[PDB]
Design a protein around this ligand. Sequence first.
Ligand SMILES: *[C@@H]1O[C@H](CO)[C@@H](O[C@@H]2O[C@H](CO)[C@@H](O)[C@H](O)[C@H]2NC(C)=O)[C@H](O)[C@H]1NC(C)=O
Ligand SMILES: *[C@@H]1O[C@H](CO)[C@@H](O[C@@H]2O[C@H](CO)[C@@H](O)[C@H](O)[C@H]2NC(C)=O)[C@H](O)[C@H]1NC(C)=O
Ligand SMILES: *[C@@H]1O[C@H](CO)[C@@H](O[C@@H]2O[C@H](CO)[C@@H](O)[C@H](O)[C@H]2NC(C)=O)[C@H](O)[C@H]1NC(C)=O
Ligand SMILES: OC[C@H]1O[C@H](O[C@H]2[C@H](O)[C@@H](O)[C@H](O)O[C@@H]2CO)[C@H](O)[C@@H](O)[C@H]1O
Ligand SMILES: OC[C@H]1O[C@H](O[C@H]2[C@H](O)[C@@H](O)[C@H](O)O[C@@H]2CO)[C@H](O)[C@@H](O)[C@H]1O
Ligand SMILES: *[C@@H]1O[C@H](CO)[C@@H](O)[C@H](O)[C@H]1NC(C)=O
Ligand SMILES: *[C@@H]1O[C@H](CO)[C@@H](O)[C@H](O)[C@H]1NC(C)=O
Ligand SMILES: *[C@@H]1O[C@H](CO)[C@@H](O)[C@H](O)[C@H]1NC(C)=O
Ligand SMILES: *[C@@H]1O[C@H](CO)[C@@H](O)[C@H](O)[C@H]1NC(C)=O
Ligand SMILES: *[C@@H]1O[C@H](CO)[C@@H](O)[C@H](O)[C@H]1NC(C)=O
Lengths: 618, 615
Amino acid sequence: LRAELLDLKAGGFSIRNQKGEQVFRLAFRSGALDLDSCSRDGALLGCSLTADGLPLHFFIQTVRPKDTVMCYRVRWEEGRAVEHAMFLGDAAAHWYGGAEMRTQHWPIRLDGQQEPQPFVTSDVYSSDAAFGGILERYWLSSRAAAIKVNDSVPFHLGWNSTERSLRLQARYHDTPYKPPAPELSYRVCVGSDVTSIHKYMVRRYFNKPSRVPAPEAFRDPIWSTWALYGRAVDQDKVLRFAQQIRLHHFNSSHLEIDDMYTPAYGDFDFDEVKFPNASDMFRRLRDAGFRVTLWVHPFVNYNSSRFGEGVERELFVREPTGRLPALVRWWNGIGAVLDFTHPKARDWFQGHLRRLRSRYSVASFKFDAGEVSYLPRDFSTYRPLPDPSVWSRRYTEMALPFFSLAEVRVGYQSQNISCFFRLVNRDSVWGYDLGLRSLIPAVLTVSMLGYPFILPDMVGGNAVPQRTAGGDVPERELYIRWLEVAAFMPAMQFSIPPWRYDAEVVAIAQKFAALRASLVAPLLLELAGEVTDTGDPIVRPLWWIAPGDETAHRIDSQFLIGDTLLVAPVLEPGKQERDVYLPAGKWRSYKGELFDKTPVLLTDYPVDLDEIAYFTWA
Amino acid sequence: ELLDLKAGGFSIRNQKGEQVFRLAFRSGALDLDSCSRDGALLGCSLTADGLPLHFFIQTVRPKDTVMCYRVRWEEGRAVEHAMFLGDAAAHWYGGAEMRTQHWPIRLDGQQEPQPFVTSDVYSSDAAFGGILERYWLSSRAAAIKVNDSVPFHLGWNSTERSLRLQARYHDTPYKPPAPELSYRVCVGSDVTSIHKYMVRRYFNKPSRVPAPEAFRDPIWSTWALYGRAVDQDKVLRFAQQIRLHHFNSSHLEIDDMYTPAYGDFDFDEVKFPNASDMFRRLRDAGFRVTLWVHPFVNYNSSRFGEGVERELFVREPTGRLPALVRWWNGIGAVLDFTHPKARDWFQGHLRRLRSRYSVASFKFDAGEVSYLPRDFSTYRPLPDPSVWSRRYTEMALPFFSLAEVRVGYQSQNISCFFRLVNRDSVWGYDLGLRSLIPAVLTVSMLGYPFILPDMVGGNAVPQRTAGGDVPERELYIRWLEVAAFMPAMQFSIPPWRYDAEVVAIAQKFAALRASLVAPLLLELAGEVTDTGDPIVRPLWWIAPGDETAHRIDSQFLIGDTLLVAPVLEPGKQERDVYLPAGKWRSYKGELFDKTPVLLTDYPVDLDEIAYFTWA
Ligand SMILES: *[C@@H]1O[C@H](CO)[C@@H](O[C@@H]2O[C@H](CO)[C@@H](O)[C@H](O)[C@H]2NC(C)=O)[C@H](O)[C@H]1NC(C)=O
Ligand SMILES: *[C@@H]1O[C@H](CO)[C@@H](O[C@@H]2O[C@H](CO)[C@@H](O)[C@H](O)[C@H]2NC(C)=O)[C@H](O)[C@H]1NC(C)=O
Ligand SMILES: *[C@@H]1O[C@H](CO)[C@@H](O[C@@H]2O[C@H](CO)[C@@H](O)[C@H](O)[C@H]2NC(C)=O)[C@H](O)[C@H]1NC(C)=O
Ligand SMILES: OC[C@H]1O[C@H](O[C@H]2[C@H](O)[C@@H](O)[C@H](O)O[C@@H]2CO)[C@H](O)[C@@H](O)[C@H]1O
Ligand SMILES: OC[C@H]1O[C@H](O[C@H]2[C@H](O)[C@@H](O)[C@H](O)O[C@@H]2CO)[C@H](O)[C@@H](O)[C@H]1O
Ligand SMILES: *[C@@H]1O[C@H](CO)[C@@H](O)[C@H](O)[C@H]1NC(C)=O
Ligand SMILES: *[C@@H]1O[C@H](CO)[C@@H](O)[C@H](O)[C@H]1NC(C)=O
Ligand SMILES: *[C@@H]1O[C@H](CO)[C@@H](O)[C@H](O)[C@H]1NC(C)=O
Ligand SMILES: *[C@@H]1O[C@H](CO)[C@@H](O)[C@H](O)[C@H]1NC(C)=O
Ligand SMILES: *[C@@H]1O[C@H](CO)[C@@H](O)[C@H](O)[C@H]1NC(C)=O
């Protein structure tokens, strides 16, 4: 059976574009159709029975929303689980989108075998199976086809590398999804090029942020206490850090005071031991020209002076019967988690944040955690969440009153929250496993999902022992190369500072701060103001401007800021040159060279330790 | 044998030809053409709808006078069989402690099968109480034991007078280690013989006897008298007042609340400034002391953190974190008595209280799985959740001599006292005066000889009290009188709360208990170890062929030789008394030797109980 350019068989379907290329192929894996049960009424193709003879609500509806776009609405509705296997295709077909992951490849590459698991916001820092804090049920092909899985679906995702398939599953057994009868539905749209079809899908499904964060956050470096000091942060260390930033002649968007400044997790005011005179600390920081943000989280531990208050006022996520709080474990221990569906728990959280601003003139907050992997398997909330990841959304709404200098590390339809979105903890390693090579794939993936204001975590990574190339801190060359690429991303955050290394590392950092300020920042601010209208990302893949270009489809070592700044950092140790691809148009190099014969690969393009290759539209 | 199997159910007859058991299949019907016989085994492979089935009936003749029928129905589809109680002449005993306790068993209205698990029935007429067994006995000398394997749920239907026996795994605290309903129906010559066979087969006997003074001297509890507000001064004033009114004491039981928070084991220094001195004074005044304990650690307990970190608590289903519970004293965790570490932790605190304060033993309160979460996990798995109650009652074993528990799930071989759940200060069968004999008989039937019928006069809860503030004078006296003849006797609201006559009546019944009742209780207690027979016996125990003895809920036996007939109604100075076969000497000296007989309008004044001794 043919529905426009879609071939339906018993065991699956395939779709072609007008050129006659196969741009989508899908197998039914929880059963087969009985084609004799299928009838066509206009654009609608419905089927009533499976091949085994079970009743079924299946349909394919053809929709022509534009002259150059054909969409296919698909529904398979049976307690029997639904699975369709979406084939990525041959080596020339490259896919983008889905979730932030621990090992982030661009284009998407998933190794081995994974049985479908809940497609929900998880902390992937320790897990290569899980799906990260920022995700969307959206996959885009370099062959100008895209799939959006319906928000209704109790959606689980697996993969099979042998047949290079995504396993799309709807199920209600062994999952944190509740019903408001499994149901897998989605829309496949086919366009003329990858950029056009992407823009159609983004405008249809994702909201835009309508505001821009503080302009200094797109220019001056952010300074975090976390990687430098860890939990042992205190009043003296914060002031010594602030002083050292000024003496080494660096600007600051703000200083972010991290874990731990409270006596217990759940308390909001300062530990009087480690911060004897917080008021004085903030007065000195204000006088020295530092805005300040504070690390906050949705947890109240059992030994918090606020745990009792939360239980009695019922501000916590509950066990399934909805009567008592449910205990959770996070990286800082055991307690409850605040229910952001509950107006009282929202007012309670907000009240403590407004008190910290009122008292200490704190500008905004680092909103840490927010993943449903830190909620119990099965739970209840003041308002029901059949889709559990909507809890992540509700937590990110806590940033709205302080959006201007706020960061969150989760996004579930959080795109219209006009704050920064931080990548989960990068490790001080070179590789794609949360390392230097993960940065461009991860930022591109997040940008694709409609989150323009991206903070790529910490320059040099978090320097976790056993996860650090160089033992104690990231090795010198890793720090420099990271610093360089980080200078061209929308927000830039140091923790382990340049003066931990040597005068040359400091000099390189000062150079990239100055270059960021004069070249990058004016363009970031223009593009940030443009988001409100266009909904286009700030960090763009090479294929954005060269959508018909197979090399631009594959590249993970280069990116664009808007359409006009092309960046090609060195991402390998012991290299003073790299290959640079210029995809289309005329490009002026940082040294003044005019390249007007494109597309072209520049072979062995010189880039010394203290340099990055960048090119501007001509 | 004498079992007729049809498609829709079966019936069983005794050798006299009476129908002693009738059961309907309610989750399907048998295809009789699928049934074949190999010796005593009758197996069937398909239902009437044509579904595959593991069904069998095996005939077993274990004794000359006993025929048993092993039945299995094994299908995720729930199994339900409806057991018919029969006509008005058929009377049934056993099952669970209930809020409204009738004898024989009477269940009103309609109840969908619900989990047959240890619950706190104080506020609930549907639920099954802390002491229960899947065991039902007929006055027609038939009994059923439901297999321990069954994920067993019980309902009832008063219209057809049926028990609804259900096996299901959906919406229940039962986990599997495929629903399965199996049971054994045994038929004997008389109700007492068949009961003794079933008890010896299924229930263990306690091999030890509690402290002899617990069967003689009254127990004194602070609970109904003082409530939570109990203090060091109040405990000492109570102890003094017991001595000044010339009463003996087995021991004084200090109840809720003596700790700063629930989960702490040592004394609140505010309400008990010098606990050591309090216990020294009580010891000098000749008082043994027991302490109220429970399996909960509240979130505001200084011990909650320790329990979380050492993982001593019942967990949520994934078995990683503690699960919070609500009980009558707030929100916290519950200790996992499947966990050796949590058992050692609990025991350690109890041994410290004995070592420090010379406390004799403990009141082990709660223990029902209705205070555990719907779905939970434990160090060792409990596919049958009520085994948690068993594991909690094992905490009494080292202090059994003066211990009480209020739950029993195969806890019979734990040689401590078993307390009825809170009696209310009312006359009726809803935890009132009329509930006492049915409840004690029901518990005795399940192989628990050492029974404590809670508090003389009840707990005096406002809105659940005949007389407002305390139980009305006549209720207190009648309760006191029947309580004097039960295996253990516990006052809380004391006689001197009322008047000199109530005190005098209490002193009389204390003296009578000491000289008549206590020597017999101790003999029968020592006999349990060998016979496994209860102390408190129904009239039908000695008169098993007697239809009147089958029905009576207002009389009981201590052993075979002491017959008790208390007044259980306000404004009555007489009652009808039934004497079964044999010769009886009344408390006034009258020889009744023309029996069985109904004594009509037998005089019993306010300060008296009717009792008779074998002659
Ligand atoms: C992953 O995909 C491969 C290829 O589709 C699956 O392997 C096939 O399995 C079927 C049985 O259903 C065999 O008859 C085929 O011969 C297999 N083909 C190959 C190339 O191995 C495999 O089953 C899938 N794995 C999972 C976990 O679903
Ligand atoms: C911001 O984005 C959120 C999330 O998509 C929008 O919230 C949805 O709004 C519609 C219309 O009111 C509701 O029916 C949905 O239930 C909302 N979803 C959630 C998860 O809250 C919100 O309206 C957006 N606001 C703007 C102005 O863009
Ligand atoms: C006391 O009673 C308990 C419970 O009936 C007995 O424990 C059982 O012992 C059997 C056989 O050794 C085990 O297979 C069961 O697992 C135990 N059941 C439970 C629920 O714990 C115990 O053995 C009895 N002890 C004595 C001496 O009578
Ligand atoms: O503790 C402060 C720290 O928290 C977050 O990182 C933690 C992460 O969420 C865990 O998965 C990991 O095991 O532990 C990390 C801390 O050691 C946060 O992302 C980080 O920036 C910092 O705020
Ligand atoms: O509070 C001590 C008290 O506890 C027990 O009785 C409680 C019962 O378990 C609850 O169901 C009821 O709602 O509240 C009762 C206390 O008010 C116990 O049985 C009793 O003897 C005493 O120890
Ligand atoms: C997607 O979900 C919406 C809301 O549940 C529903 O109306 C629509 O029909 C679904 N689409 C398909 C193709 O099943
Ligand atoms: C530092 O801040 C000052 C004041 O806003 C500004 O004029 C200057 O351009 C900034 N320099 C850099 C390198 O960011
Ligand atoms: C009762 O349960 C036991 C243990 O699971 C089993 O072996 C036995 O056969 C069952 N009895 C019947 C009658 O099904
Ligand atoms: C109770 O039994 C009657 C008569 O046998 C029957 O008609 C009725 O449906 C039963 N009720 C329930 C709730 O099963
Ligand atoms: C009370 O206890 C005393 C001292 O042990 C004992 O001699 C007496 O027989 C007991 N009397 C009663 C009525 O319990």
